[PDB]
Amino acid sequence: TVAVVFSSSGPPQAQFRARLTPQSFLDLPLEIQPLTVGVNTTNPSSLLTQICGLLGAAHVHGIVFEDNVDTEAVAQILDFISSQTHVPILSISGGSAVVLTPKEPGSAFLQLGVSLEQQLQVLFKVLEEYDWSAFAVITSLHPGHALFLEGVRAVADASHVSWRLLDVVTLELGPGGPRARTQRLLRQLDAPVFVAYCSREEAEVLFAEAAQAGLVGPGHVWLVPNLALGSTDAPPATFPVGLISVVTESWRLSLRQKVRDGVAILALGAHSYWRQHGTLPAPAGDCRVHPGPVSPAREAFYRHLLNVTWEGRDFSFSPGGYLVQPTMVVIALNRHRLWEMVGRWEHGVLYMKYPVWPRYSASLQPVVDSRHLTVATLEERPFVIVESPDPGTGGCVPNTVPCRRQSAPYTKLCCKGFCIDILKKLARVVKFSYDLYLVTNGKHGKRVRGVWNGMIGEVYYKRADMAIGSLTINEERSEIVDFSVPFVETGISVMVARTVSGLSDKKFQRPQDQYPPFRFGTVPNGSTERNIRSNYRDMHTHMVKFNQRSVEDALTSLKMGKLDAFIYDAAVLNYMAGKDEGCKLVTIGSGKVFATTGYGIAMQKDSHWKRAIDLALLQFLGDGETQKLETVWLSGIC
């Protein structure tokens, strides 16, 4: 048998009947007969008398609690009762589901919640991803403030980033006290990120005071644990929009649904113990007698009661009465005063709905940071390399940047390469922030009747602000999108198998050879095939039967013997001939470069960045760091 108790809400007579009705709900192998009890008011004698009477006149094996208006100092009574009469109980919701760390020795409470350590871990896993590192910690004079202050420091030393702390302050945010002193202390602060710990009344007082002393505008960000924010279904006034909290799963289920989970976990625990010994332990419910030394049978049943799994939800209780390894979900206050999901957490890796933090204003109209820009690119093997994050610690190796392939759902890869290092140094010197995302359409750029795809398309239509990578310079692009000075020098080159004297040779100029027809490369839809077609019609006509899949399959075709000559860029062709199986070489060499242009950073027309960072590129080229990067990333054997 399993008991059920309600408290302090709209009278759930219909809910009580609906809970009592499924005497066989088929939610587990075997179903003990459920019974329901309801207390009118929450009080010490009321609760004590009801539970003692029910469990002494019913002979019950387990009992499931349901919470109330969320007042404190109620879980202690449950701990006391469970320790005395040795009956396992379980709290499911409200204020009684707040973790009690030093529980009684022989008690079996098992309240589903999360300790401050796990919540702080999740919060610092969302601070690291957006890279704030401000740490303005504010705590009121609360009973548990010392534990929070110890935990934040303990976790601060358990990560990679320095986490430069700025200030921690403790103030009397109670119903009665000097408001002027707290006003003075709040008026003197400077940090873009705040972490606060207090109670709901303390939260409302502190937020009202912060609104008075101008700390709630679009400049700062606030974070609170689940202890504050109260009901979750009625956000009061003076609560800043953009508040971030972390709550466990099932923050939107029904009261009836929660009880169904509570009875299921007890039923599986008995069933799991049933397979071991084929019995259900007898109840021990003499509240009046209050007997019982340490009992091994109930101890073994409780030990087997810890781990449970059903319906694809892992409930694993630590020795302390709180569950370990849950799947928390981060929530935030939308622009219309309504809690909404922002980012999940599942086996230690954090996700987010937004690649950047939306910042709102007093009259909404989401402001955009002036010193932040979006950069488009894609993968070119010598220059941009994409690697999936390692299963090591969630985030990938340092000296790499997060980078996501846009297409709502996203997978966070992290891109590496030469142009990435250039971008990192540019961000270091010009003092700006950025986010990087790969392109999905055609590689580099084309004009199919005014529709430009690729990075040039994403920049020309004002969906991006730069476009770094392997992006050469030509007459067409330079008309519609700006450009900066070249930093890597390329052209057109031919790779052969280790026979021609340039493009003007009759081998390529006159495709009228009888026995041997020569074969070309020309991976289409790129820069080179535009110039080649525009300047030599016959070659374009005769180049239809040319292998065109990538810069990878062309090497295989050349090594096989199905193709004779490759035409492509120079900076990638000569590098590709540096590290090769054997030694495949090109024509005469750097003397054979045709239409010698250079790589560049595209920009929206008339952008104020252009002048600022062209000088930085020139400075970087002047003193020779580019030579070091080239010798690190662009060296070969043969």
Partner: peptide, 16 residues
């Protein structure tokens, strides 16, 4: 030739 500064056989991993 396995140098100490950087070998392309070492800088770029090979199969053998």
């Amino acid at each position: 030739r396995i140098t100490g500064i950087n070998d392309p056989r070492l800088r770029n991993p090979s199969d053998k």
